[PDB]
């Protein structure tokens, strides 16, 4: 089963402190259009937040404008780091939360 379009339909956040949920950068994304899902890396057995995630949207476009609207965008007091999660280098991020689950 084929699935590569997926791969352009997601962003990878990074530089998220603490401070700057999936509530908030939802938020922040949401002002680049409807985003479908928003996924970051927890560590269950720290039970804390890594710091960086993906948010995976309905539409190329629209992910691709939130990473030009966004990518190092101020806001955590430092940059909202994105980049495409088709990248070479998230690649390795995303070998991580290469999980595969049902999830719109």
């Given at each position: 089963?084929?699935?590569v379009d997926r791969s352009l339909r997601?962003?990878?956040v990074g530089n998220i402190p603490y401070e700057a949920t999936e509530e908030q950068l939802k938020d922040?994304?949401?002002e680049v259009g409807p985003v479908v899902s928003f996924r970051l890396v927890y560590d269950?057995?720290?039970?804390?937040p890594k710091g960086y995630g993906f948010c995976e949207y309905q539409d190329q476009e629209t992910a691709l404008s939130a990473m030009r609207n966004l990518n190092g965008r101020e806001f955590s007091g430092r940059a909202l780091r994105v980049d495409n999660?088709?990248?070479?280098?998230?690649?390795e991020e995303l070998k991580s939360l290469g999980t595969g689950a049902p999830v719109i």
């Open positions: 089963d084929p699935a997601s962003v990878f922040i994304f949401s269950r057995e720290t039970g804390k999660a088709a990248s070479e280098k998230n690649k």
